[PDB]
Structure 1
Amino acid sequence: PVTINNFNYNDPIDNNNIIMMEPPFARGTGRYYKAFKITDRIWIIPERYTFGYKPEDFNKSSGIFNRDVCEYYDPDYLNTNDKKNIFLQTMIKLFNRIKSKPLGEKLLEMIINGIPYLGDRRVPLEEFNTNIASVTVNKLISNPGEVERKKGIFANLIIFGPGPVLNENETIDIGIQNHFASREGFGGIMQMKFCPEYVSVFNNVQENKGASIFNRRGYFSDPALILMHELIHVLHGLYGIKVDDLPIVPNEKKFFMQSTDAIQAEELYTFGGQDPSIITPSTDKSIYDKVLQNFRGIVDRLNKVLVCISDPNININIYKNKFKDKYKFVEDSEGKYSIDVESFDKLYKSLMFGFTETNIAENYKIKTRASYFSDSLPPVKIKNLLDNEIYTIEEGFNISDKDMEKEYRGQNKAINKQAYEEISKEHLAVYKIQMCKSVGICIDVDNEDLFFIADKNSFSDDLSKNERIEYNTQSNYIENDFPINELILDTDLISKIELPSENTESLTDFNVDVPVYEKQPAIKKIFTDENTIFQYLYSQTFPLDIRDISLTSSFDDALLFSNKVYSFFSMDYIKTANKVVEAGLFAGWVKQIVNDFVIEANKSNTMDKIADISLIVPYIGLALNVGNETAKGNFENAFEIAGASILLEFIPELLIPVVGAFLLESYIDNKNKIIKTIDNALTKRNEKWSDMYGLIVAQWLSTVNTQFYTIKEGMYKALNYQAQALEEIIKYRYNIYSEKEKSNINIDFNDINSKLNEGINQAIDNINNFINGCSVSYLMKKMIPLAVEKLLDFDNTLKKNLLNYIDENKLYLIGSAEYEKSKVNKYLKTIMPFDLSIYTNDTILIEMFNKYNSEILNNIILNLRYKDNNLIDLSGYGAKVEVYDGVELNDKNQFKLTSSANSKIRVTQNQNIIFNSVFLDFSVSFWIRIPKYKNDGIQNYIHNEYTIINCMKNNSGWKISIRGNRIIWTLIDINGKTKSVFFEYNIREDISEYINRWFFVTITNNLNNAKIYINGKLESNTDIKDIREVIANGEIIFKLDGDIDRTQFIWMKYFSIFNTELSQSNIEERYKIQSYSEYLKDFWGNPLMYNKEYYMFNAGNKNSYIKLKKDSPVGEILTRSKYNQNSKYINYRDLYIGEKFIIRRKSNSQSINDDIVRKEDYIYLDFFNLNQEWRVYTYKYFKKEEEKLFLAPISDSDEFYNTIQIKEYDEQPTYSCQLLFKKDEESTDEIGLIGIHRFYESGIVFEEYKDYFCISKWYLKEVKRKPYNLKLGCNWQFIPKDEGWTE
């Protein structure tokens, strides 16, 4: 167990547990410090840490020590005996809290027993030298007022009070002659500057601190966790594993880049969580090797140590036994020490990945910041840690009987205000970048608000080095993980070996290197005329001495006038916000503008499914203008085109090394070693893929995800500024009124703020999801593929290497010169899929990844869309698309392939996308419109098959072809084996749903079947289990290829490819999404237009058509004529028959040019009667259920309704529309829907039934039924002449 001693500052010096110490950095010259032994080998010195600091630097100034910290200064802290005693009792309480749990008690025991080796790099292997500043520290025995007698003592840790900056805790190791024992396996006396009362504050980006933008946000730290964080650094320094290696360094070449000190891997390990993932597997192994090498040196020393010259009283065996246990070396029957790989591996991982702030926080149920790279906030002062009503050894601030155990309420600033006090900003120093415009206006920006972007020098290039493949070579992986539970239960982890006595000979060699610290300017001037995130955020604020503001959508005016505040919300919102009303209308206006705010904020849930983008926050560009001028133009459109990339402030230059070659060692004649060598190269190859991926992840986390973090914080500040601005206006307007008026105004500010805050929280969640999606998108589409390229290239090179090796050694492989090549061929075939969880176990990162992978749209590897008069790939993988001159394109995303040699599209797909999942797994979807056969060319139409889309590489691939009325999907594997599945629509139908009409096609492929879906429905299926590998990323050629008629053509739209099999559910959804339009369609599926001649079709009476009756102002219904020739293969009913109707716009006299007919539009349904344009009317006064429509010349009569509203009652995709007559546009009085009705006629000679063009109220109720009745006689379609249909 661990015993924590008790004592008061005024207790007498006894030269044993209470001493007068001569600190290492004192160089043995004057001034001793009263020190207290809190536990064995651990001392507390309740005084400010002054080594290396100027006395005046303890006062707040115009300077700062660290550029990434809100520094608090207070030269009076610890300036009295009573203050020193409070510090002591507080440290005693914190150590008790630490050992209150096994994990922390274990940390303390490891630290107490991790005694520094007796010596350093300068000591002969055969000796123990205690006479060095990193091993022995002196205590003054003599009476006060005389350095008469001094005694030496061994120590592990000395904790001082804070240096100039109270909240800047730090652990310091001892360097002598430019070298650090604590970094070379020996370990050495560790020192710390610590302050328990002034703790850091942090706030979860995703999590909302009690969700209260008007109250204090964030959480304050548990000083016991802060202490344990530093103790972990102590632990590393004591075991001499605080090695230096390739550090993470921030890029500082641009004015928007955050400046910080270099960050060593050890610091990130200490924190834990996701931070270790920023240290590449390459650097992880480099550090492991350095520490292991350091331990080899110590184990050698233990085998050679013979004497201790400095202290004749040192018992050599006792120390050898102790050091053997410290480093977990093994000892043979004769006392020979050696390194045990298993024990070393366990010790190393326990020290680097077991004891981490994250792991400890989780075990002690203490809340802490999410990452070392989170923004720093001003600290707070804990009122009294010695008061058990506020802080306890067992629970810290989160005391259960105070109901503050849940959700870490005890550390919540908005909830546990009784626990802390805010700090005087007067004593705070913060490093700021002053961005001033050219002559100039200047804006101060806290260095913490800038973008942290790791420089490329931060990452290891070890992957570019060559590797020797021996027969015993093995691949190595260092898991940045460690079972915290096994650590807590690990028996032999803790020493049961006697701790040697601390008294030794006095130190006489005080040689030591003492750090010198200096403040630097707290403000750095930089010139820039850029208006990026910092300026946009700034334009949304107003001075404290101003209370009357107005909102504006003009960023420039907002900058210029102190009374103008920028807003990225709608024009209307801005207008209403600036509205002034009478007291009697104030409450109404408040409810209105507050509601408007919530509506505006909520636009953050905007969907864009037609562009294959599920979520998009439309106003991000206007709010921050971050990245590539995102405030200009339409953000949604700019995003559909370039994606996540447009939001980045800086595109990083990634390190993606050419993997070094493999040098397989030769073992002539020996066959066993030769085979082993082969396999080792293979397994090592995988280590290369994994390490490369780790390299990518590390860079993504420290150069890309960091920028997206800044953006998330920026949107939080932006939305808050907006709410604050609206609140300022509401207050100003309310205070203009008299007290008498105010008394009659029904307003509740707490409710106003509650509503504004809730809207912000909703917006924040959407924004966080959107941004995380963008970040992962960039990783998967803009980073991983670049790595895959290098890795595939490496594979090819190695393949050649190995095969050859098999050849030069075939004379030793006897009956395996074949078996080995096969194993190699298949191995370098299946590539390694990227799995983020392999490089990190952080919950938010993993769920971020899993979410992205669960969204079917991220499986799109090709998405040809129209943009700026051209077809381009918006999938995000950057396919090269060459559209030749003979391809017709329009803004409706339709493209036409003709019989011309230059009517072609060439697509070069990205070769670095995991398309080969070993087994076929992909889908292709697109819309198509195939022209009707030429009646005099039916034989060739049914006989000649022609390809339309071909994707082949090395004689393998897929293709889409057509043979008359059949569309065919064909696969060809590497062996030339072929299989096809097809859809054939009937060409003998009176009325076809497919011929010359737009329809949706979807082809899915999995390991077993190949199926074709048409308009969301499964139509055909083929068993393709016998199909071997199919190369599918070859060049895609869109072009009619075969024996086609010169008039042959094909229209296509929305061609896309998914690297997975779409489900019937996904397909049905895509069909509905791509079918949607505000406008109605015509018979062929194209947009319905005004001023366009159309024949009319009735879905409920397919073979019927309308004709003006000879001597009657009515439309008689006749039977369509039909295909007349003798071909046995075809049949249809004529479509270009009956009156030629034309649709006219009701309002706006913007002439009769043309335009799109939209649902709900009011129209006139006219038609041509020879040289005149007639109209369709409805006699107003009929009492029956239905009546014949009145067809006559254009004119206005009180007796006839002439206005029609075009409707769409079907909720599912259809080309039918309905026509409604309403009393008038405003009324809700429905006269009826246009249809066909049957009448009985009995004349003097003829007796029969005849159908007429009518209006009927009966349809009104029928169109409400579900599922929609497609057969209703009120369903019409408009047929314009089309080159794709001849009769």
Structure 2
Amino acid sequence: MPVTINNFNYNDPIDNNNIIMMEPPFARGTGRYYKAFKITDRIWIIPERYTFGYKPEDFNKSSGIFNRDVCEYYDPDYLNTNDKKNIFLQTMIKLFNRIKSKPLGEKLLEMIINGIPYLGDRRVPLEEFNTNIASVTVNKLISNPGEVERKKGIFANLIIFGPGPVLNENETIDIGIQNHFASREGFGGIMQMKFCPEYVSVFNNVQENKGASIFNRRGYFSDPALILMHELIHVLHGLYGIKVDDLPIVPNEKKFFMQSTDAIQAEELYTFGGQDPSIITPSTDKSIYDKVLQNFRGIVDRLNKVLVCISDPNININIYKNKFKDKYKFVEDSEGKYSIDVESFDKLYKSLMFGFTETNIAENYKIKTRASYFSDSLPPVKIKNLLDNEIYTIEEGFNISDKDMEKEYRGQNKAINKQAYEEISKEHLAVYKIQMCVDLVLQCIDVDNEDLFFIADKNSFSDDLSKNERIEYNTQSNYIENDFPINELILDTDLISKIELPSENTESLTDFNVDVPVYEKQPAIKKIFTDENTIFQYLYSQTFPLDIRDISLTSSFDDALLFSNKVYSFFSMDYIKTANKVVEAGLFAGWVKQIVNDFVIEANKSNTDISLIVPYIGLALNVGNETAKGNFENAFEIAGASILLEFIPELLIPVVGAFLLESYIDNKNKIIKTIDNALTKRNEKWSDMYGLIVAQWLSTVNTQFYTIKEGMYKALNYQAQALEEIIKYRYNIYSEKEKSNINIDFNDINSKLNEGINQAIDNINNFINGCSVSYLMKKMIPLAVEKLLDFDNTLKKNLLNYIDENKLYLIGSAEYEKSKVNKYLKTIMPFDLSIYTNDTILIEMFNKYN
């Protein structure tokens, strides 16, 4: 059935149906009940702060943070009134209506609703259903006149709370019992969510096209409906019990400049989609696939052995057998035995993991989102009113075509849609900072954790390529594509639920055994000591305090750090001396016209062995290999992409494990199949190796080059802010008569300097992407290929010897198979970057390379 969204006010009475007093999983049967509203079937909204595992003091902003990743905003007063709770409800209703306004989101919701948790746990015997567990059953309190008195159990799929202490930290939580999680083991379980629709993340698009302003790179706020949908994909993964853990991406923390973060799971990167799944190696891709498939084999074994329900005799065995068949897409034969169809499972697995994706959804709803999970995140903002249809609609969100806001996501642009958001007071924002001290005169700088380089540790990547391989007659090789055509997902019928939803009513919960997570704050500051002045210092030397009036530019970095009226500039000597020039009022307009024009010329500097090089990057940042000293062009011309890297990573290139070939005496066909299966497995290992190199490149090198791009945007903005301050000061120095006659437009100066910046960032983008790809193609790929050419020779020797040891059992085609092995192992698999990315910008850089 088509997805129905319910309507209700917070003040509406308890009907024991769509509005109930509920005992949530982490309440632990302690007599605490919450007013819960059924927004859709199996999904409940509770307009209350998420308190479980926290302390009351946590809801206030202190000197600590919960997550090093996040710019955390605190507000204890959020949701402290009945009216505030009603707003929350109405906004959630509105967001859910926006989700189902397009088919794709409707599919996501219908799959959540119908993806009921398996009536069991790992502790539950294979022959039984059990609804007496916290991941399946939730309790409601009935309050009527003197006739019936008790608790009553209902089935639920998703319970949505208000935020925890951190308003903008939306999280989806799964239920753990006895150190294990049902939502990671094929069963599935009641998913919980803490959510706040009003405080949204901010991102930027620093890697784009167009040299004109058109308000490029000015900042973009996120669409609350997309954020919710990101969490709904987690909910989906959890209800299908496929939200598994494998080898995570763990940040390297052995250097001061390296970013600090918790481990990043593949489930998180699959959810985001886009370029990110390529950061999860093909070995780990298969590992996750196998664990999911094995879990599904457990459930299919359970359904074939299930006969009774222990908790409730009112539970109809056939109804739930028919529903779990419909949920997991099993096939039933003649006798009634359920089994797994691989073609069904793969379609299901790929739709849940690679179909429903933040990138796929955003690109279908015409909503701008960040480029990667590894994109820098700016300070969050408050959306004034989401219920205001002149600002935010169900159909089009922020990008409303009547307001001329649809074109290029203008409705999300911070510089255009000023009236949609309010900036947040930094007194309420907690940010994980690194206090950096350089060697009376000791200089300290508070540096955001977000502005540090993300570099994946060596232990992030799998070594499964080094393991041996048993090649038998039925050995099947796999490629799991980190892609799924979105139009096929929208039009697919097999994923739509066939069997009707069972009634939510059941027996009350008596077993309250649950693992509740515990959260504590850590200090938000860390002091480091170092000898090197790098980017953080060089960027800071381009800033000035707000009280300083007569600032002047300097090409001396030391003088800029020491003098607070001195600001470091990386442009030419002529630009600096022109900017520090004091003229009579009559020639001022000419000077403003000259210096602004000079800024644009200086920023657009790019002389022309591939693509174009921007020469001031070294002076601007001093990134990597002391690039501010000497001449950057010369230093690049010798070494190349390397000099810009702050850290040269240790590459993981495993020696490919030997193939062990099975013998089949008096069976010709099984000998021929084995030789064939070994050659197809060779292609798999080549593809996997390429995937391992790309995985490391994206998370260890390409991220460093992204930080340089973000550094250059800041550096160029600092130079514009310095020039604007100088012009403004020089303007105000004149008399009131003088100011009147020779006037300039401050909006004109802003837009012109901004347009030069976008043109410059374009040049830097082109150059840096060139560096990144160049590094992959020169310093990474060849080394992998070299070990694959060793593996080929080893396999050549192995297969040829195998043919000899079996020459009599073939006879008719021994020389045929020998020439088959010879020619197939001369075909080297071509490396194609289009398999891993869809950026087009990086695709062309790869194509230009010979």
Normalization by structure 1: what TM-score? 0.65
Corresponding residue of 1:475: 477
**What is the CA distance between 1:124 and its match in structure 2?**
0.3
Aligned residues of 2:50 and 2:194 also touching (Cα < 8 A)? yes
Q: Name the CA shift for 1:211/1:140 in 2 (closer, same or farther; >3 Å).
A: farther
Instruction: Decide whether aligned partners of structure 1 residues 147 and 729 sit closer, same or farther in structure 2, where only a CA change above 3 A counts.
Output: farther
> Do the aligned partners of 1:140 and 1:147 also contact (CA within 8 Å) in 2?
no
Rate the CA distance shift 1:843–1:215 in 2: closer, same or farther, 3 A: closer
Change beyond 3 A, Cα 1:26–1:670: same
- Provide the secondary structure at the position in 1 that maps to 2:427: helix
Deviations 1:867-900 (A, max 9, x none): xxxxxxxxxxxxxxxxxxxxxxxxxxxxxxxxxx
Q: Match of 1:379, SS?
A: strand
1:383 to partner: Cα distance? 1.1
Kept in 1: contact 2:61–2:430 (CA 8 A): yes
Superposition deviation, residue 841 in structure 1:
3.5
Deviates more, 1:458-467 or 1:213-222: 213-222
Whether the 8 Å CA contact 2:210–2:758 is kept in 1: the answer is no
Question: SS where residue 36 of structure 2 aligns?
Answer: strand
Equivalent residues in 2 for 1:233-382, closer than 5 Å: 233-382=234-383
8 A Cα contact 1:126 1:307, kept in partner: yes
Contact 2:332–2:339, Cα closer than 8 Å, also in 1: yes
Q: Displacement, 1:842?
A: 4.2
CA contact (8 A) 2:160 2:193 kept: yes
For the Cα contact (< 8 Å) 1:605–1:763, is it kept in 2?
no
Larger deviation: 828-837 or 155-164?
Answer: 828-837
Change (3 A) 1:145 1:54: farther
TM-score, normalized by length of structure 2?
Answer: 0.98
Deviation per CA, 1:1212-1231: give whole Å up to 9, x if none.
Answer: xxxxxxxxxxxxxxxxxxxx
The structural deviation recorded for 1:605 is 4.8
Q: Which of 202-211 and 287-296 deviates more?
A: 202-211
| Residue 589 (structure 1) shift | 2.1
2:567 pairs with 1:565: yes
**Any idea what the Cα deviations from partners look like across 1:1077-1097, whole Å, max 9, x if unmatched?**
xxxxxxxxxxxxxxxxxxxxx
Distance 1:173 1:276 in 2: 22
When residues 752 and 199 of structure 1 are mapped into structure 2, their CA distance, relative to the original with a 3 A threshold, is same
2: CA distance between counterparts of 1:588 and 1:82? Answer: 58
Say if 1:515 and 1:210 are closer, same or farther in 2 by CA, change over 3 A: farther
Structure 1 position 213, deviation (Å)? 11
- Output the CA distance in 1 between the equivalents of 2:148 and 2:719: 67
User: Contact 2:205–2:217 (CA<8 Å) still a contact in 1?
Assistant: no
Q: Judge conservation of contact 2:215–2:415 (CA < 8 Å) in 1.
A: no
Cα 1:209–1:252, aligned 2, differ >3 Å: closer, same or farther? Answer: farther
Q: Deviations over 1:929-953 (max 9, x none)?
A: xxxxxxxxxxxxxxxxxxxxxxxxx
Deviations 1:967-997 (A, max 9, x none): xxxxxxxxxxxxxxxxxxxxxxxxxxxxxxx
| 2:172 is the alignment partner of 1:189 | no
Name which of 634, 655, 674 aligns with 2:652.
Answer: 655
Shift of the 209–392 alpha-carbon distance from structure 1 to 2, 3 Å rule, reads farther
Instruction: Give yes or no for contact 2:201–2:379 (8 Å, CA) kept in 1.
Output: yes
Match of 1:621 among 595, 618, 621: 618
Aligned partners of 1:216 and 1:413 also within 8 Å: no
Q: CA deviation at 1:599?
A: 1.8
CA distance in 2, matches of 1:569, 1:436: 27
Offset from partner CA, 1:268-287 (integer Å, 9 cap, x none) = 00011011111111110100
Per-residue CA distance 1:17-63 (angstroms, 9 max, x = gap): 11111110011103210001111110000011000111011111111
- Deviation sequence 1:1126-1175 (CA, Å, 0-9, x none): xxxxxxxxxxxxxxxxxxxxxxxxxxxxxxxxxxxxxxxxxxxxxxxxxx
Contact 1:209–1:414 under 8 Å retained in 2: no
Q: Secondary structure at the match of 1:378?
A: strand
The verdict on how the C-alpha distance between 1:476 and 1:165 changes in structure 2, with shifts beyond 3 A counting, is: same
Q: Distance in 2 between matches of 1:802 and 1:849?
A: 35
TM-fit CA distance, 1:148 = 5.7
Call closer, same or farther: CA 1:750–1:390 in 2, change over 3 Å.
closer
Write out the 4+ residue segments of structure 1 that deviate beyond 3 Å after TM superposition. 142-148, 207-216, 438-441, 840-845
The answer (yes or no) to whether the contact 1:141–1:149 under 8 Å persists in 2 is yes
Deviations 1:704-737 (Å, cap 9, x if unpaired)? 1100000001111111111111111111112111
Between Structure 1 and Structure 2, the one with more strand by share is 1
User: How far apart in 2 are the matches of 1:13 and 1:750?
Assistant: 57
- Please identify which structure carries the higher helix content: 2
Q: CA offsets per residue over residues 1020-1041 of structure 1, 9 Å max, x none?
A: xxxxxxxxxxxxxxxxxxxxxx
**How far, CA to CA, are the matches of 2:346 and 2:216 in structure 1?**
48
CA contact (8 A) 2:332 2:338 kept: yes
Tell me, in whole angstroms, the C-alpha distance in 1 between the residues paired with 2:847 and 2:146. Answer: 69
> Cα distance, 1:367 vs. partner?
1.1
In 1: Cα distance, 2:465 partner to 2:611 partner: 38
CA contact (8 A) 2:189 2:241 kept: yes
Q: Cα gap change, 1:147/1:463 in structure 2, threshold over 3 Å: closer, same or farther?
A: farther
Equivalent pair of 1:127/1:307 in contact (CA under 8 Å): yes
Deviation at 1:845, TM superposition (A): 3.5
Preserved contact between residue 211 and residue 758 of structure 2 (Cα < 8 Å): no
2:606 match: secondary structure: helix
The answer to whether the 8 A contact 1:138-1:507 is kept is: yes
- 2: distance between equivalents of 1:403 and 1:791? 55
- The Cα of 1:817 is off from its aligned counterpart by 2.1
Q: Deviations over 1:359-386 (max 9, x none)?
A: 1111111111111100011111111111
CA RMSD of aligned residues (A): 2.4
Contact 2:206–2:217 (CA<8 Å) still a contact in 1? no
Identity %: 99
Give me the whole-angstrom Cα distance separating, in 2, the residues matched to 1:222 and 1:157: 21
Task: Name the SS of the counterpart of 1:818 in structure 2.
Answer: helix
Matches within 5 A, 1:138-217: 138-142=139-143, 149-207=150-208, 217=218
Q: Which blocks of at least 5 consecutive residues in structure 2 are unaligned?
A: none
Aligned to 1:714: 711
- Of 65-74 and 590-599, the range deviating more from structure 2: 590-599
**Structure 1 residue 426, shift from structure 2 partner:** 1.4
Structure-2 separation of matches of 1:72 and 1:432: 15
Match of 2:599 among 597, 600, 621: 597
**8 Å CA contact 2:430, 2:524 repeated in 1:** yes
1:438 shift after superposition: 3.9
Q: In 2, are the aligned partners of 1:209 and 1:218 still within 8 Å (CA)?
A: no
CA offset at residue 407 of structure 1?
0.9
When structure 1 is superposed on structure 2, of 133-142 and 231-240 the one drifting more is 133-142
Which range moves more in the overlay, 110-119 or 746-755?
746-755
Asked if structure 2 preserves the Cα contact closer than 8 Å seen for 1:605 and 1:766, the reply is: no
CA–CA distance in 2 between the matches of 1:427 and 1:145? 50
1:331-356 deviations in Å (ceiling 9; x for gaps): 01221000000000000000000000
Higher relative contact order (CA 8 A, sep 6+): 2
Determine if contact 2:399/2:405 at 8 Å carries over to the other structure: yes
Structure 1, unmatched stretches of 5+, are 607-611, 852-1286
Larger Rg belongs to: 1
**TM superposition shift of 1:147:** 13
Contact 1:773/1:848 (8 A) holds in 2: yes
Q: How far did 1:492 drift?
A: 2.4
The answer to whether the Cα contact below 8 Å between 2:135 and 2:182 also exists between their aligned partners in 1 is yes
Deviation at 1:668, TM superposition (A): 1.3
CA distance in 1, matches of 2:458, 2:54: 34
Tell me if structure 2 keeps the 8 A contact 1:22–1:33. yes
What's the CA shift for 1:207? 3.2
1:2: Cα distance to partner? 0.7
- SS state at 2:639 partner: helix
C-alpha displacement of 1:210: 11
Q: What is the deviation of 1:143?
A: 5.7
Distance 1:542 1:802 in 2: 69
Deviations 1:576-601 (A, max 9, x none): 11111222222222222222222211
- Partners of 1:145 and 1:746 lie apart in 2 by 83
| CA spacing shift, 1:147–1:241, aligned 2, 3 Å | farther
Sort the Cα spacing of 1:300 and 1:613 in 2 relative to 1 into closer, same or farther, 3 A: closer
Indicate if the aligned counterparts of 2:215 and 2:413 stay in contact, CA closer than 8 A.
no
SS in 1 for 2:44: strand
| Per-residue deviation, residues 794-821 of structure 1 (Å, max 9, x unmatched) | 0010000001001111121213221111
Contact 1:215 / 1:414 at 8 angstroms: preserved in 2? no
- Tell me, in whole angstroms, the C-alpha distance in 1 between the residues paired with 2:687 and 2:649: 21
- CA 1:460–1:146: 2 relative to 1, 3 Å: farther
* Per-residue Cα deviation, 1:589-627 (whole angstroms, up to 9, x for no partner): 222222222221121355xxxxx3441111111000000
Q: What is residue 526 of structure 1 aligned with on the other side?
A: 528
| SS state at 1:83 partner | helix
